[PDB]
Amino acid sequence: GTILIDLSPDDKEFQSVEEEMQSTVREHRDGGHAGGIFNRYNILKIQKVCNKKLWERYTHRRKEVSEENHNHANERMLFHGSPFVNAIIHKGFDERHAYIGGMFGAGIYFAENSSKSNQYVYGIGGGTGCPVHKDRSCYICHRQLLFCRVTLGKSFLQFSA
Amino acid sequence: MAHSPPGHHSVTGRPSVNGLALAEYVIYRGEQAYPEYLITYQIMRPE
Numbered sequence: 001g002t003i004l005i006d007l008s009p010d011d012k013e014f015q016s017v018e019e020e021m022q023s024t025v026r027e028h029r030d031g032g033h034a035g036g037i038f039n040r041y042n043i044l045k046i047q048k049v050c051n052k053k054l055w056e057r058y059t060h061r062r063k064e065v066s067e068e069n070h071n072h073a074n075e076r077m078l079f080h081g082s083p084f085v086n087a088i089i090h091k092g093f094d095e096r097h098a099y100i101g102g103m104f105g106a107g108i109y110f111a112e113n114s115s116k117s118n119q120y121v122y123g124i125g126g127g128t129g130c131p132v133h134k135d136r137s138c139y140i141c142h143r144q145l146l147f148c149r150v151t152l153g154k155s156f157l158q159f160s161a
Numbered sequence: 162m163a164h165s166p167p168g169h170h171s172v173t174g175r176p177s178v179n180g181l182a183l184a185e186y187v188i189y190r191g192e193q194a195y196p197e198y199l200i201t202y203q204i205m206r207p208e
């Protein structure tokens with residue numbers, strides 16, 4: 001039931017998503033080992049993901065959370081990077097996209113820094129890099145991230161390194 | 162998949178060392194996220 005709609009680079013909606021992607025790049029403490037060495041991206045395409053059933057699943061749960069948190073869903077737009085993005089856009093997020101050994105336990109992880117999600121595009125620790133060149137810092141191969149609507153509700157605050 | 166801390170819907174990983182890092186978040190139900198935009202890109206080699 002999923003369809004992808006290409007946004008024009010002239011669309012303000014393209015432009016605000018691009019800016020959120022570009023402006024949240026930072027340096028990483030691994031010197032680029034997982035994700036590569038870059039200060040910015042070449043954006044090739046941005047597509048809107050439309051799926052009625054996945055949307056209604058999301059809005060149903062959002063209402064539930066909201067009603068448990070003084071009518072506040074505490075919704076953000078956050079990045080997700082994964083070798084499973086094609087399964088995710090067609091069938092939605094589920095436990096098979098969990099990070100079983102993540103520092104906050106086994107759930108589905110999201111980032112404010114696009115460059116952080118970029119580190120998981122080829123897998124945990126960047127895996128073995130791009131399928132074609134085995135390069136975690138490949139400048140040639142096309143990568144894909146998701147920019148997602150995430151309901152946080154009442155969020156447990158964990159301070160951490 | 163695990164459960165959120167009781168009384169909570171998610172976790173916020175608040176960085177408390179790397180001054181430049183923004184937050185990371187975890188949810189424990191697939192239905193609390195919608196994948197709105199698919200972005201295709203390349204990282205750029207710095208000059």
Ligand SMILES: O=c1cc(-c2ccc3c(c2)OCO3)oc2ccccc12
Pocket residue numbers: 079080081082083084097098099100109110111116117118120123124185186
């Ligand atoms: O975008 C992310 C994807 C993932 C991620 C983790 C484990 C995975 C995964 C993605 O797909 C394969 O197993 O982790 C993150 C951790 C912190 C902030 C963002 C991310």
Ligand SMILES: [Zn+2]
Pocket residue numbers: 130131132133134135138139140141
């Ligand atoms: Zn490559």
